[PDB]
């Protein structure tokens, strides 16, 4: 028996962190590309899956 | 960026040339309508009279 795929899961980084908000999200931009470089990671996974 | 979907891509990829294949761009989050406040009926009246 072998694993082959794992469940494809993408997670919006911008909502998870700042949910349903704005004046939260403005802070989230001061951290740079984290959110945008995460979804890249979790995509690279979910693509090769 | 906002003209239309195709031109959101180019703003994600930082490219005018965009090759084939599905890209994620943004996240549409249905925005609420108004509000609901719901509390029991008054339960009591402080002996004002
Ligand atoms: C509140 O008022 C309505 C008026 O019809 C009544 O039907 C209901 O049972 C009441 N409930 C409470 C928790 O006050």
Swiss-Prot record, chain A:
Disulfide bonds join 13-35, 18-24. Precursor of the fusion protein processed in the biosynthesis of the S protein and the formation of virus particle. Mediates fusion of the virion and cellular membranes by functioning as a class I viral fusion protein. Contains two viral fusion peptides that are unmasked after cleavage. The S2/S2' cleavage occurs during virus entry at the cell membrane by host TMPRSS2 or during endocytosis by host CSTL. This is Spike protein S2. It comes from Severe acute respiratory syndrome coronavirus 2 (2019-nCoV). The lineage of its organism: Viruses, Riboviria, Orthornavirae, Pisuviricota, Pisoniviricetes.
């Amino acid at each position: 028996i072998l694993p082959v795929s794992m469940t494809k899961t993408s997670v919006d980084c911008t909502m998870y962190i700042c949910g349903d908000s704005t004046e939260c999200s403005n802070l989230l931009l001061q951290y740079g590309s984290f959110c945008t470089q995460l979804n890249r990671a979790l995509t690279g996974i979910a693509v090769e899956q | 960026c906002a003209l239309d979907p195709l031109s959101e891509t180019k703003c994600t990829l930082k490219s005018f040339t965009v090759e084939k294949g599905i890209y994620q761009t943004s996240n549409f989050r249905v925005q609420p309508t108004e509000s609901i406040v719901r509390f029991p009926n008054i339960t009591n009246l402080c002996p004002f009279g």
